[PDB]
Amino acid sequence: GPNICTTRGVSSCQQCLAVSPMCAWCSDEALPLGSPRCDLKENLLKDNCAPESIEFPVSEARVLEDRPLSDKGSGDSSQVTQVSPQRIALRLRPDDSKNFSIQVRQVEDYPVDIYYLMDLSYSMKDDLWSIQNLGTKLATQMRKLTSNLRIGFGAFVDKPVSPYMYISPPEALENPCYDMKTTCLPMFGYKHVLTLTDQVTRFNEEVKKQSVSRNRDAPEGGFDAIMQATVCDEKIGWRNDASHLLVFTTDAKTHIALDGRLAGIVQPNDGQCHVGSDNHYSASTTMDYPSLGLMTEKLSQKNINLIFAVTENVVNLYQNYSELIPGTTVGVLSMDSSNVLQLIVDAYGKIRSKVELEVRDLPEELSLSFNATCLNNEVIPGLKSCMGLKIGDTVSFSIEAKVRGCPQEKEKSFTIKPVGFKDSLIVQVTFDCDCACQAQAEPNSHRCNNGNGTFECGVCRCGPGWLGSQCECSEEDYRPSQQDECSPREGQPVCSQRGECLCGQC
Amino acid sequence: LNLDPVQLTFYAGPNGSQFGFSLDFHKDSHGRVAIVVGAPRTLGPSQEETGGVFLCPWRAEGGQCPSLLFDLRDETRNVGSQTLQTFKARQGLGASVVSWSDVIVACAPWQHWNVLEKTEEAEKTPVGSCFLAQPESGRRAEYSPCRGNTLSRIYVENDFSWDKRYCEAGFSSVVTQAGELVLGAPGGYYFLGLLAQAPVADIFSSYRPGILLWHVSSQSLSFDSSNPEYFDGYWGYSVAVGEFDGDLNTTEYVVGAPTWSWTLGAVEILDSYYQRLHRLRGEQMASYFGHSVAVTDVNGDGRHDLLVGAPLYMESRADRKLAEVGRVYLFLQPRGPHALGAPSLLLTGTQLYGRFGSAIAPLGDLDRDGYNDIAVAAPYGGPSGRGQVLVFLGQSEGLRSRPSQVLDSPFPTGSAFGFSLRGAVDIDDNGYPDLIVGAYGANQVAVYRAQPVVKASVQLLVQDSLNPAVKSCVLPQTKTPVSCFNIQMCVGATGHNIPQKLSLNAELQLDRQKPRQGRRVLLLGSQQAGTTLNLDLGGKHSPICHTTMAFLRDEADFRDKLSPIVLSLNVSLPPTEAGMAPAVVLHGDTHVQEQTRIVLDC
Amino acid sequence: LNLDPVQLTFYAGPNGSQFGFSLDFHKDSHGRVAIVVGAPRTLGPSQEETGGVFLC
Numbered sequence A: 001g002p003n004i005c006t007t008r009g010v011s012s013c014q015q016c017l018a019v020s021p022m023c024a025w026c027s028d029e030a031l032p033l034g035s036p037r038c039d040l041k042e043n044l045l046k047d048n049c050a051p052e053s054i055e056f057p058v059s060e061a062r063v064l065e066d067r068p069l070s071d072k073g074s075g076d077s078s079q080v081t082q083v084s085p086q087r088i089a090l091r092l093r094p095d096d097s098k099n100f101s102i103q104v105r106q107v108e109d110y111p112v113d114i115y116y117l118m119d120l121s122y123s124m125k126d127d128l129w130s131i132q133n134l135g136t137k138l139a140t141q142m143r144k145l146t147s148n149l150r151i152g153f154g155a156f157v158d159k160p161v162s163p164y165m166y167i168s169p170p171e172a173l174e175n176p177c178y179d180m181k182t183t184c185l186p187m188f189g190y191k192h193v194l195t196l197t198d199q200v201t202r203f204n205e206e207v208k209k210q211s212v213s214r215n216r217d218a219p220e221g222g223f224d225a226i227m228q229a230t231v232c233d234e235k236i237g238w239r240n241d242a243s244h245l246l247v248f249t250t251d252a253k254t255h256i257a258l259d260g261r262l263a264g265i266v267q268p269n270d271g272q273c274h275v276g277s278d279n280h281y282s283a284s285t286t287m288d289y290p291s292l293g294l295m296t297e298k299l300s301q302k303n304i305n306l307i308f309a310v311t312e313n314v315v316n317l318y319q320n321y322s323e324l325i326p327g328t329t330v331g332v333l334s335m336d337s338s339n340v341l342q343l344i345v346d347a348y349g350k351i352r353s354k355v356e357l358e359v360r361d362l363p364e365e366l367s368l369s370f371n372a373t374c375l376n377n378e379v380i381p382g383l384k385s386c387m388g389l390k391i392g393d394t395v396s397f398s399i400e401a402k403v404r405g406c407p408q409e410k411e412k413s414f415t416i417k418p419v420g421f422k423d424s425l426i427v428q429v430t431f432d433c434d435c436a437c438q439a440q441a442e443p444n445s446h447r448c449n450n451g452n453g454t455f456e457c458g459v460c461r462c463g464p465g466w467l468g469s470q471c472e473c474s475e476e477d478y479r480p481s482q483q484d485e486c487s488p489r490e491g492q493p494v495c496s497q498r499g500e501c502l503c504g505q506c
Numbered sequence B: 001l002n003l004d005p006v007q008l009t010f011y012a013g014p015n016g017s018q019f020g021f022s023l024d025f026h027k028d029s030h031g032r033v034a035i036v037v038g039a040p041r042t043l044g045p046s047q048e049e050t051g052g053v054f055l056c057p058w059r060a061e062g063g064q065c066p067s068l069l070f071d072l073r074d075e076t077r078n079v080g081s082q083t084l085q086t087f088k089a090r091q092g093l094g095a096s097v098v099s100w101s102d103v104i105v106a107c108a109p110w111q112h113w114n115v116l117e118k119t120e121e122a123e124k125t126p127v128g129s130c131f132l133a134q135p136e137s138g139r140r141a142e143y144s145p146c147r148g149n150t151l152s153r154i155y156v157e158n159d160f161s162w163d164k165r166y167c168e169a170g171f172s173s174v175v176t177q178a179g180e181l182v183l184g185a186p187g188g189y190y191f192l193g194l195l196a197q198a199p200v201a202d203i204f205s206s207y208r209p210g211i212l213l214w215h216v217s218s219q220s221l222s223f224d225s226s227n228p229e230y231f232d233g234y235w236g237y238s239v240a241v242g243e244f245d246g247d248l249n250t251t252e253y254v255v256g257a258p259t260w261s262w263t264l265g266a267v268e269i270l271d272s273y274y275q276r277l278h279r280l281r282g283e284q285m286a287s288y289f290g291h292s293v294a295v296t297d298v299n300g301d302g303r304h305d306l307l308v309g310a311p312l313y314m315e316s317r318a319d320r321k322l323a324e325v326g327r328v329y330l331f332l333q334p335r336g337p338h339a340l341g342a343p344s345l346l347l348t349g350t351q352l353y354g355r356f357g358s359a360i361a362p363l364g365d366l367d368r369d370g371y372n373d374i375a376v377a378a379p380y381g382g383p384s385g386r387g388q389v390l391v392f393l394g395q396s397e398g399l400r401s402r403p404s405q406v407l408d409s410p411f412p413t414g415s416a417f418g419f420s421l422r423g424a425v426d427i428d429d430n431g432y433p434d435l436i437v438g439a440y441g442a443n444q445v446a447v448y449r450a451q452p453v454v455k456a457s458v459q460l461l462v463q464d465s466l467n468p469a470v471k472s473c474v475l476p477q478t479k480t481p482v483s484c485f486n487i488q489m490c491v492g493a494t495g496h497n498i499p500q501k502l503s504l505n506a507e508l509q510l511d512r513q514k515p516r517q518g519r520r521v522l523l524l525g526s527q528q529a530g531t532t533l534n535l536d537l538g539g540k541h542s543p544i545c546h547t548t549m550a551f552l553r554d555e556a557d558f559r560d561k562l563s564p565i566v567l568s569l570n571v572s573l574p575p576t577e578a579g580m581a582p583a584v585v586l587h588g589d590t591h592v593q594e595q596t597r598i599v600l601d602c
Numbered sequence C: 001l002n003l004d005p006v007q008l009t010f011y012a013g014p015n016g017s018q019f020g021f022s023l024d025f026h027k028d029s030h031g032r033v034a035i036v037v038g039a040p041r042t043l044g045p046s047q048e049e050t051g052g053v054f055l056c
């Protein structure tokens, strides 16, 4: 009928297929009337031109690597798979859309890494007295939910620089709480106290050896500690097999980026590990605070869930921070942190109660649409995250990719991944824009005036130099009156006296 | 738009001196313009980071500059019982340089100050100190409004009320037209922030060399507030002056509080008595809404307009939920001054972690069209992240939402190209404001000169619709008769300081819709439907229009008698790339289309 | 106010005079301008009382 492929001009394998995926190119060297080569497959198959020589790529999405979802991650965490499939090969012709599905299951007892980031400001001294025996009780409560728990510890106050640290008299540089007659320890930006380890006795031992320091202003250099803990895999000792938790305990506001200019610090924070051999942040005085964007990016890149265990005076503030960073939640710590164990347990439960998809290194051409199928068969379109899950539950996501145009690379790979987990799906999208017959070009097609036209795809590409049917029109347009005019059997006036009969238009 | 990116001026400072952190234009008495550049980490006399200010005279090649010799030396003066001390170590002399009339105010915000009374003291805190100078006469002076002699325990006794020990006054310095220096101390009143305003004449006339703690009699300071919102507001991070309340006698200050109300951010417009006329809240927390503030009348309606910067704004992209790019807000002041409300324009950056909005410089009227143009700098934007500056032109409604021009960093990565911006001053005196961009990472300043803007005008006249064969003037080189007519196109080039070598090019396309060599309408001469010819306007107030005789093909010859006959007149600059850089910018209408039809019985 | 008197452009005509009775600026379509001067008492077809116009 209409065959929008037939209109809009006909060039080669590229153009007809680029017009619409439904369009097909009948490269077979059949009758030109019988092989227009720019039409739908159904129309082309009727008029022959299809001795399996037709060009019509079919978009496909083959599962290259799939393993069944586990059900209990007690042993061989490396062999535990939470995302099915794991790697797919997708094929798309230009301006075509195709969808698939993924299954995400949170295992029953997954290994857990809890890192305790403690604000060692003076007002948090009482809290330090309710944490001494945190390791034993935390292990006791967590053993009901995991079997490979590993706890670490780090401390932070603020940058050891003038506007925040007392610098007079020189006795205050070694006891910033000298005037209140008590003894504190020198101001520190962030120090990594205990590496993540299973021995909770080590956690209870490193605590009771920590002392609080004193800072001037209410905001604390906290996000610097979060950044350094996140970006230091070797020092903190994160396992790339476990549920990474980073409990953030504080009672005041926090120093967002660009605040370091108050201390002469203008060099922006870069996501690098500067914690030296002494377990001290060695660039705290010569590097600005990290911004929310960079902190979020480094949290996602290292698969860390963030728990703001913050006191009641700042909770709303940090709550408003939680709705700026995926995979974070806020708990109401007490003045002396008398319930941080329950807070950590419930926060871990809530974190495991939500699954949110994240797309990584997605090419700009691809556009994704998500339909989340949670418990029962209800599917909510649009959103890529469904809540309400429990431990062991399984959820599914229907994901549609939609490429616009045709990238010249023809093969790009991106990642679909639930937030926090290491399990990921690698989608290798191959753009099948061109075709074999297009690659099989014959510019020296003797059939086309001794080879001045590229026989690429049955038709001959010769351009304005030879734009005739047989690549014979030595001059562009119909002005030269290309040889073998519309005059039937030749020797006839202007295509049977029809004036400009315009090739087949007579 | 017309800022030359090819020929730049490079002003260098000492290595690692942060030469370019802040900059301003100083006008010598003779009208000769110089650049004042702060280098807040220049080596002091005792091989220590103290600060410094360089007075770069304007040249073409550029290079090293002389420095203003301030007093880099710790001061100790015992006023009877007490012992006042000023520590000029890592003070940051040059973090805020502003030149007014013949004086230069170079502020060191991190200069420290202590008061040793017997055993007690007032704590060695940074109060800041602005250094005023007159390089043509040598008159030096200092201004430290936040210095105090109250002992530390007194503030503890009175809940740290009116605690001005951590002001860092000079963090952001502006000077009103009336000669009042206004300093934003973000850390004053225990990091609430304040404004310290004092006449420059009084500052010069109340300073005695040797006395460290004095009191300017006419200075005014902000008010400490018990409202929990202002806490840690950094109210004074950025400060600007403008007219926002009506009466031109009163001058109003625009002050940024980037962390106002729990890092939400705000900008306050308030009169000289520091009565808050209006408050412009932030939009997204931790975006630093108030980091940079500029005041200029972009829309030209005669009322000053406000430009706020949030370098850490995380936009809500479709693919990326929150990406840190930066955002500049444009607020337009209407009549009924206490009605400035929702933002009028929301410019947003592109590169991630580029900090779009770290510097908003009013450029004046760069294009010279009666509307004010600005420059917004992203020090880490650009595809390679080395730094970009985006020029936005003004228009009747807000200003252009796309960058007319984009300047890229000529320095290696990390140079912070764009951190400091300053413009609206004709450096070379060619009638067009220039721009100075300070990349302190490379310790250099780039000076961009605005080349002249040639405003073009096009008027292509085709008399009427014509008949295919009127059998008038014969086809060229033949007695064969055809239909003929005239094509006349007048092109004008009006602009300021245009050179005498201006020669545009007129592309005359005859019925461009049809393919060439066989068009429906050709020329009565060479028959080429497309004729591109040079038309010189090197100092001609009269547009020049070379009429051409055009031939029309036979009615039977041309078969599309229903398609419109559309002639194309395009104006382009000549290939100046063969020689030096293009000496002009051909902004304006340079491409028009004129349509006619085929008439009958005529 | 700024008309240069010390330097002038002098255009000659016929010895029969009248060269300058009326004149105007012929503005070429190309943008050029030339001075057209009518001399209404030049020679005729045969030494007759006629006019005549010059283009300078």
Ligand SMILES: *[C@@H]1O[C@H](CO)[C@@H](O[C@@H]2O[C@H](CO)[C@@H](O[C@@H]3O[C@H](CO)[C@@H](O)[C@H](O)[C@@H]3O)[C@H](O)[C@H]2NC(C)=O)[C@H](O)[C@H]1NC(C)=O
Residues within 6 Å of the ligand: A316, A317, A320, B261, B262, B264, B281
């Ligand atoms: C955390 O975020 C929430 C949601 O934005 C904040 O609550 C809302 O904060 C906005 C501030 O933009 C309030 O709007 C303003 O309220 C004031 C009165 O306080 C009014 O004078 C203004 O005209 C404007 O309407 C809004 O009322 C408020 N709503 C609720 C239900 O709280 C919250 O304050 C944030 N908490 C922080 C930053 O600690």
Ligand SMILES: *[C@@H]1O[C@H](CO)[C@@H](O)[C@H](O)[C@H]1NC(C)=O
Residues within 6 Å of the ligand: B247, B248, B249
């Ligand atoms: C502004 O000051 C001038 C002083 O000459 C005065 O005449 C005028 O009335 C004032 N305008 C006001 C107060 O609106």
Ligand SMILES: [Ca+2]
Residues within 6 Å of the ligand: A123, A124, A125, A126, A127, A335, A336, A337
């Ligand atoms: Ca406490």
Ligand SMILES: [Ca+2]
Residues within 6 Å of the ligand: A157, A158, A159, A160, A161, A164, A165, A215, A221
């Ligand atoms: Ca600090």
Ligand SMILES: [Ca+2]
Residues within 6 Å of the ligand: B243, B244, B245, B246, B247, B248, B249, B250, B251, B252
């Ligand atoms: Ca006013």
Ligand SMILES: [Ca+2]
Residues within 6 Å of the ligand: B297, B298, B299, B300, B301, B302, B303, B304, B305, B332, B333
């Ligand atoms: Ca305005």
Ligand SMILES: [Ca+2]
Residues within 6 Å of the ligand: B365, B366, B367, B368, B369, B370, B371, B372, B373, B393, B394, B395
């Ligand atoms: Ca303008």
Ligand SMILES: [Ca+2]
Residues within 6 Å of the ligand: B425, B426, B427, B428, B429, B430, B431, B432, B433, B434, B449, B450
């Ligand atoms: Ca200039």
Ligand SMILES: [Mg+2]
Residues within 6 Å of the ligand: A121, A122, A123, A124, A218, A220, A251, A252
């Ligand atoms: Mg605290």
